[PDB]
Design a protein around this nucleic acid. Structure first.
Ligand SMILES: [Mg+2]
Ligand SMILES: [Zn+2]
Ligand SMILES: [Zn+2]
Lengths: 1339, 98, 90
DNA sequence: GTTATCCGCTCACAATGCCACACGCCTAACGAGCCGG
DNA sequence: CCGGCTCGTATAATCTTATGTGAGCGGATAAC
């Protein structure tokens, strides 16, 4: 029907089924097919469902339209349309009751969770193997106690009429309604208030939440068991018309026939007083038959004749890649469409495409019919059909009137990102292929290798106007993933423009003088002066530094004839120094980009067209071919290979004498072949790039070459140094598929021949790369599918949330070069707070403005290192994202409008380039200030600097204050310098030992042995070839039971032998000793201030991004600190080693367990702040969230995923990854109960908690306390309020079972739901629809 | 291969696929993500409802084009009623409120 | 013909009010039978609607003002017809 | 002893889109049919 | 002169190169 709100779901009562149906099927036969009338009371019928033909009795009595409503008596068939055959249900009244298969085997077992009874027991009740007891009463036995035949017989001896024990589905049906619901809830609530054990509280909170949701619905525990089973309207499972004889049956019809045969046989056996064994067996057969009908997968049994495939049950018509969500309710086939192969056609403009004439007559047939019947050239529709099937000459003029302003959508099939479908205007072509403008071809990522494209037609008025405004190809220049133009001129235009704008030192007409650029053109056409000969010309140029107008300026510049020709298509704005250089690929790309920045939109489009036209024209007049004498072999290749063979023979002889081992032999050979390959490549590149010597009109000079493939590489059209390296120099080192890299490299190039073995070796890398591509495609597609499932319901919905939180951005520095500066990251995001000038108390930026480009430069000039800026993850708006929390939009210019469905474009921007992926001393480098962060150090006796703080960090600074470089300075290392010591570059400023942990002291004196007994705790090991016998101290577990209860310790004393206190505190720090602690300076030996007491020895591709957005737990994570306090070890081997951290003021209830196998960092007297590392390794983000706050997990995810995308040169803006992070941490647990109705262990979406706390804080009550969860993206999709949006995604079965038990109700808000139903989307245009509806509802 | 108005399937009232059976193209799922990614709203409504699965909607649209008036009639897709009728074939009540 | 759109998005508010306003103007121009302000150049109604948007003679406030004015004139004219019927009866 | 945990075994559920093309989708034995021997 | 043959048709049966997850449940496991 129409005008309906939210969809409601619940269980279905038997009386509801009798309210549905229109008759009772009794006979299992479909049709007689002697005559093809349907059999009465079969699966097909006419009295039950409806008329076979239109408006006719099956008897054939009433055949007139004016007899509607009155049924026949010859056939009992209501004279109605055959659409009624699509819509009337049927019912079957079963003999025995029957268990539903989903509620038994969803696995959370709904019956088993409800009755508190294990699943296997209920299974061997339902399949007739046991008994249950139903109100035994004055009986030894209990209720849920189950038996066998022997205990049942012995009970019949004992309590022969007391207990009531049944079996089969009737017994479970008896147990279900015998149970109350209120008493179980109140009893188990009192029991949960009388329980402290955790797992019992888990199970009981599950059971009472099940019961409370089950009572707050409408339904009952009787309804999980079927009694009356409904059947589908028989047009919806149609009988296949074959050719000759019989009709081919579907799967549903065979399953219903089997069920009805079994039901009739059981009903007759009940009619004749059958013995008990046979009716038990028959009820088991009927239960198994209904379990085969509803879902064939739990018992994979029903297979048909001549095709041993599982038949398609009703649940198989919903799941999978062919059920009604993925197949038919999202991707529908569409009329007015078409398909062809494509073809270039370089004469087009940017906003049009080539359309075949005949196919365009075929598409627009109704518009043609309307134009013909308008102009009087026809009267009926059949006259118009005859005229357009004759293809008379008036029809082509009519078709050209139909085209003129009516755009057409074009599409390429594996659509990744939102530039995949675009709208053009048509230009008619007598042909059979679709022409397509060549600049757009990079955006589609189209070949011309046979790639096919498709055509759709917008046909209403709003669709034409949207395809003109929102989607015409003159409106998509910048990319939504990053603000870069997608209209880069490709390979051939690059070659043309690079060949035009060069120079050579002696040509025709060199050094003459010219008037305009057009006289240089007239000299090029006549053949008087060549295309590139240097010449002084006169140029006028316009500069718009005047505030909104143009300033002329005329001068004489030393330039080239080709550059003067190219200047004629540059518009008024740009300065002449944009076309004075050699103009490769990136140069003309930034030419287009600066033309977009300074002038606007329309000169950018028309300038890209003029560039494409003249680039193809002069690429034609070049004649740049390629030939076998354009690949210059070096003259020095032969002796380099000879010297490499001499060196490998010498290393082979040094291995043969036995001096060098095999691994170092391997390493020397691979190093010298790497060096030889690099030398040959250097020689060939130096021989190609500059060999061209030409006569000056003096003697000789040098210049950049005019060789063919060097122009094809130096312009950046096709190829790199690597491909042109393999063509003439030798090719690399081929690696075998085991993972090793082979000894002998391929000594030959491609211009010479390869022999048999070397080609056979190269085949390995070929097939490896091909298989990698073949699997990488599918994995990227699946990950894109899941991300756009997650982020779909999120729309920029209001203007200004108006908060004062956010994040702090600093330009990222690994320690090598600064990877991303502050300009590129925080271009175009709205400032959180007023970042002050380095001139203090001077407002450099207002707190609530937008960092546009000029403003970004004026922020850059004062060398700001950290800017605070508003993110999406802290935006305040319920059910959406505020506008100023998201900033300016990519692919357009200004701030984002209210409605842009940013979650979908974000998921596409992450998931689009997924195909391109794959599947001992600190040394400063420049001069600046030396800053050490979290440093607490002391100079020892030997002048070295040992640090008593773990978290020391190195910052190389300039004179300004911005960070030049950064490194990590370990705890207590060998430091060549101190803090703030102004040093210069190239300096190794630090060192340490990777096999010695610092057990450094704090005072001077002696070190004495407390509980360090040789034979109990410590051992005396003599280094047998040096002479310094030392002591080795283990931990408690590695030594035996003689020192297991003992704790060895190096007690820090003075030279007298007494504990000198730490300067600042009053605590003696005796040093208890961990394992592998080699104590060198023993008792009686004087120590220093912080001296080494004990020496202690110790992915990346696409699945990294997959395992990160799943947020799955890494192996052996890093233990953090829960709250600050003094560390204290405790009891050993109660599973693990205990640890108690005592706060300064609060108590210490948490006594954390640590596997003593894994190592540790902190010491006993040491105390650390919360969230700090204990055992090194990977980290799960759960801990990062619950300890370091909310922004920390966003920064961790952004930096890691952005490292994986910076490794391949892929540039993706950060706000997309932020708005994917927001949809991951939306659920929440509750810590208290609060003052409202929320339970404690209640998982609940955060925004409802936030509006509940806002409503309670409006009054004077107390709120609730919540811990923000963090789920995987598939777990976040699969737990959503809309039960449609979780049904369309994977595991539809479990979602429909849980949603049908709970009886939910889906508001239809979001994108995916309204696509399913088929009204306007609440995202784009139609957003302005929905709130216009919403104010209609509330008022 | 092209199509203006051709044949339809039996179970769901969608057009067929292929060249030989005079079919229309599969405007699949990822293209729906792409139209959601623009601000395109009405065009998604035609590609979902007027071009297929709304019977009275599409015949009203065809007559309305031949008459020379570009309107549309939204309606409700027949495949969704199919989905309702085979969820009701299980034991699951599912209705539409209001 | 018309290639660009950016003369209208800087006149009406965003890229979404332009769609609804120009579709409404073209729908009342095509079928309701009203004469366009600027002259045609044998183009369709969508393009002449976008032209009247970008020059600045059609706007959403202006559409509602004109529709209110002509509808008030319509009900006033049929009230004049009712009073003419009342003159014809008595 | 008995109780609250830790760990190994078993099992459901996912794995891009589109296109063309092409050939496939029962029968040994239980209720009727013909009429010969 | 009913079904022996012959047919219309309704309907039952002895794999064995996969991976990665999560999620749950039965059996051991370390304490007052
Ligand atoms: Mg291709
Ligand atoms: Zn009848
Ligand atoms: Zn906000």
């Amino acid at each position: 029907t129409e005008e309906f709100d939210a969809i409601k779901i619940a269980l279905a009562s038997p009386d509801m089924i009798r309210s549905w149906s229109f008759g009772e099927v009794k006979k299992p036969e479909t049709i007689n097919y002697r005559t093809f009338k349907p059999e009465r009371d079969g699966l097909f019928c006419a009295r039950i469902f409806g008329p076979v033909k239109d408006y006719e009795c099956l008897c054939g009595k009433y055949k007139r339209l004016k007899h509607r409503g009155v049924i026949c008596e010859k056939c009992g068939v209501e004279v109605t349309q055959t659409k009624v055959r699509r819509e009337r249900m049927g019912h079957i009244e079963l003999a025995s009751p029957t268990a539903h298969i989903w509620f038994l085997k969803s696995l959370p077992s709904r019956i088993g969770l409800l009755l508190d009874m294990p699943l296997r027991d209920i299974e061997r009740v339902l399949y007739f193997e046991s008994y249950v007891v139903i109100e035994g009463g004055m009986t030894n036995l209990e209720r849920q106690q189950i038996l066998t035949e022997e205990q049942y017989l012995d009970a019949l001896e004992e309590f022969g009429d007391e207990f009531d024990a049944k079996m089969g589905a009737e017994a479970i049906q008896a147990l279900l309604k015998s149970m109350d619901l209120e008493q179980e809830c109140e009893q188990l609530r009192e029991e949960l208030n009388e329980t402290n054990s955790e797992t019992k509280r888990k199970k009981l909170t599950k059971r009472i939440k099940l019961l409370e949701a089950f009572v707050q619905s409408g339904n009952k525990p009787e309804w999980m068991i079927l009694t009356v089973l409904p059947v589908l309207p028989p047009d919806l499972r149609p009988l296949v018309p074959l050719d000759g004889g019989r009709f081919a049956t579907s799967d549903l019809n065979d399953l219903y026939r089997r069920v009805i045969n079994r039901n009739n046989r059981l009903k007759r056996l009940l009619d004749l007083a059958a013995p008990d064994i046979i009716v038990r067996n028959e009820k088991r057969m009927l239960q198994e038959a209904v379990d085969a009908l509803l879902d064939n997968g739990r018992r994979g049994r029903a297979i048909t004749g001549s095709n041993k495939r599982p038949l398609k049950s009703l649940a198989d018509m919903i799941k999978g890649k062919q059920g009604r969500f993925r197949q038919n309710l999202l991707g529908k086939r569409v009329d007015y469409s078409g398909r062809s192969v494509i073809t270039v056609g370089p004469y087009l403009r940017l906003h049009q495409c080539g359309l075949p004439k005949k196919m365009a007559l075929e598409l627009f047939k109704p518009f043609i019919y309307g134009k013909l019947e308008l102009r009087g050239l026809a009267t009926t529709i059949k006259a118009a059909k005859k005229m357009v099937e004759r293809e008379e000459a008036v029809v082509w003029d009519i078709l050209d009137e139909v085209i003129r302003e009516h755009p057409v959508l074009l599409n390429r099939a594996p659509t990744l990102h939102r530039l995949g479908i675009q709208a053009f205007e048509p230009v008619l072509i007598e042909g059979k292929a679709i022409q397509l403008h060549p600049l757009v071809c990079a955006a589609y990522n189209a070949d011309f290798d046979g790639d096919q494209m498709a055509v759709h037609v917008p046909l209403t008025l709003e669709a034409q106007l949207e395809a003109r405004a929102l989607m015409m190809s003159t409106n998509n220049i910048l990319s939504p993933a990053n603000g870069e133009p997608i209209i880069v001129p490709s390979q051939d235009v690059v070659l043309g423009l690079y060949y035009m704008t060069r120079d050579c030192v002696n040509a025709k007409g060199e050094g003459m003088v010219l008037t305009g650029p057009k006289e240089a053109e007239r000299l090029y056409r006549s053949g008087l002066a060549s295309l590139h000969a240097r010449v002084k010309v006169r140029i006028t140029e316009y500069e718009k530094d005047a505030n909104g107008e143009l300033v002329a300026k005329t001068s004489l510049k030393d330039t080239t004839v080709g550059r003067a020709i190219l200047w004629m298509i540059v518009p008024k704005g740009l300065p002449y120094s944009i076309v004075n250089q050699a103009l490769g690929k990136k140069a003309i790309s930034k030419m287009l980009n600066t033309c977009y920045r300074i002038l606007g939109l329309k000169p950018t489009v028309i300038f890209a067209d003029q560039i494409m036209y003249t680039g193809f024209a002069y690429a034609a007049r070049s004649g740049a071919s390629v030939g076998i004498d354009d690949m210059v072999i070096p003259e020095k290749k032969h002796e380099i290979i000879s010297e490499a063979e001499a060196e490998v023979a010498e290393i082979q002889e040094q291995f043969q004498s036995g001096l060098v081992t095999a691994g170092e032999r391997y390493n020397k050979v691979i190093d010298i072949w790497a060096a030889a390959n690099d030398r040959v490549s250097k020689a060939m590149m130096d021989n190609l790039q500059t060999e061209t010597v030409i006569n000056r009109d003096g003697q000789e000079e040098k210049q950049v070459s005019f060789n063919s493939i060097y122009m094809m590489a130096d312009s950046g059209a096709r190829g790199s140094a690597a491909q042109i390296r393999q063509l003439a120099g030798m090719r690399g080192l081929m690696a075998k598929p085991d993972g090793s890299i082979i000894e002998t490299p391929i000594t030959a190039n491609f211009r010479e021949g390869l022999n048999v073995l070397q080609y056979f070796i190269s085949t390995h890398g070929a097939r490896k790369g091909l298989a990698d591509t073949a699997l990488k495609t599918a994995n990227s597609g699946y990950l894109t599918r899941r991300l756009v499932d997650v982020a779909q319901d999120l729309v920029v919905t209001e203007d200004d949330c108006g908060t004062h939180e956010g994040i702090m951005m600093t330009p990222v520095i690994e320690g090598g070069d600064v990877k991303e500066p502050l300009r590129d990251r925080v271009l175009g995001r709205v400032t959180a707070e007023d970042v002050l000038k380095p001139g203090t108390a001077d407002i450099l930026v207002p707190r609530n403005t937008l960092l546009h480009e000029q403003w970004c430069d004026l922020l850059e000039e004062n060398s700001v290192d950290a800017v605070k800026v508003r993110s999406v993850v802290s935006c305040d708006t319920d059910f959406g994202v505020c506008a100023h929390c998201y900033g300016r939009d990519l692919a357009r210019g200004h701030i984002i409008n209210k409605g842009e469905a940013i979650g979908v474009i974000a998921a596409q921007s992450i998931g689009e380039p997924g195909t391109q992926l794959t599947m001992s001393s600190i040394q400063v480098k420049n001069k600046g200030s030396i800053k050490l962060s979290n440093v607490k150090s002391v100079v020892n006796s030997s002048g070295k600097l040992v640090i008593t703080s773990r978290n020391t960090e190195l910052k190389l600074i300039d004179e300004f204050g911005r960070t030049k470089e950064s490194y990590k300075v370990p705890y207590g290392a060998v430091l060549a310098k101190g803090d703030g010591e102004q040093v210069a570059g190239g300096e190794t400023v630090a060192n340490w030992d990777p096999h010695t942990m610092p057990v450094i002291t704090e005072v001077s004196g002696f070190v004495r042995f407390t509980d360090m007994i040789d034979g109990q705790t410590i051992t005396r090991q003599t280094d047998e070839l040096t002479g310094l016998s030392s002591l080795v101290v283990l931990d408690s577990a590695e030594r035996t039971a003689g020192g297991k209860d003992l704790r060895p310790a190096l007690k820090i004393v003075d030279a007298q032998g007494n504990d000198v206190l730490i300067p600042g505190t009053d605590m003696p720090a005796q040093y208890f000793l961990p394992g592998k602690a080699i104590v060198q300076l023993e008792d009686g030996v004087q120590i220093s201030s912080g001296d080494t007491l004990a020496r202690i020895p110790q992915t990346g591709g696409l699945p990294r991004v997959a395992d990160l957005f799943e947020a799955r737990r890494p192996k052996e994570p890093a233990i953090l600190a829960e709250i600050s306090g003094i560390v204290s070890f405790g009891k050993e081997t109660k599973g693990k080693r205990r640890l108690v951290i005592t706060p300064v003021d609060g108590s210490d209830p948490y006594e954390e367990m640590i596997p003593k196998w894994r190592q540790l960092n902190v010491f006993e007297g040491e105390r650390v702040e919360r969230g700090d590392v204990i055992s090194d390794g990977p980290e799960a983000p759960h801990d990062i969230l619950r300890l370091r706050g909310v922004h920390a997990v966003t920064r961790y995810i952004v930096n890691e995923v952005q490292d994986v995308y910076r490794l391949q040169g892929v540039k993706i803006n950060d706000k997309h990854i932020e708005v994917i992070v927001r949809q991951m941490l939306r659920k929440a647990t509750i810590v208290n109960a609060g003052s409202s109705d929320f339970l404690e262990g209640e998982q609940v979406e955060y925004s409802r908690v936030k509006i509940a706390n806002r409503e309670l804080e409006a009054n004077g009550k107390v709120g609730a306390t919540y811990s923000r969860d963090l789920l995987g993206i598939t777990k976040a999709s699969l737990a959503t309020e809309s039960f449609i949006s979780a049904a369309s995604f994977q595991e539809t079965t479990r979602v429909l079972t849980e949603a049908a038990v709970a009886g939910k109700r889906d508001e239809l808000r979001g994108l995916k739901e309204n696509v399913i139903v088929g009204r306007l989307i609440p995202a784009g245009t139609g957003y302005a629809y929905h709130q216009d509806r919403m104010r209609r509802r509330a008022a | 291969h092209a199509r203006s108005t051709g044949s339809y399937s039996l179970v769901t009232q969608q057009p067929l696929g292929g060249k030989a059976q005079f079919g229309g193209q599969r405007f699949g799922e990822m293209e729906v993500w792409a139209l959601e990614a623009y601000g395109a709203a009405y065009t998604l409504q035609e590609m979902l409802t007027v071009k297929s699965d709304d019977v009275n909607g599409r015949t009203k649209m065809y007559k309305n084009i031949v008459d020379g008036n570009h309107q549309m009639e939204p309606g409700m897709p027949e495949s969704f009623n199919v989905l309702l009728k085979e969820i009701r074939s299980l034991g699951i009540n599912i209705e539409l409120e209001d | 013909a018309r290639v660009t759109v950016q003369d209208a998005v800087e006149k009406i508010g965003n890229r979404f009010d332009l769609v609804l306003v120009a579709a409404r103007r073209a729908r009342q121009m095509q079928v309701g039978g009203k004469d366009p302000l600027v002259p045609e150049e044998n183009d369709k109604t969508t393009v002449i609607a976008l032209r009247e948007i970008e020059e600045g003679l059609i706007n959403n406030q202006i559409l509602d003002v004109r529709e209110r004015q002509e509808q008030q004139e319509q009900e006033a004219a049929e009230l004049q017809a009712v009073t003419a019927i009342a003159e014809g009866r008595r």
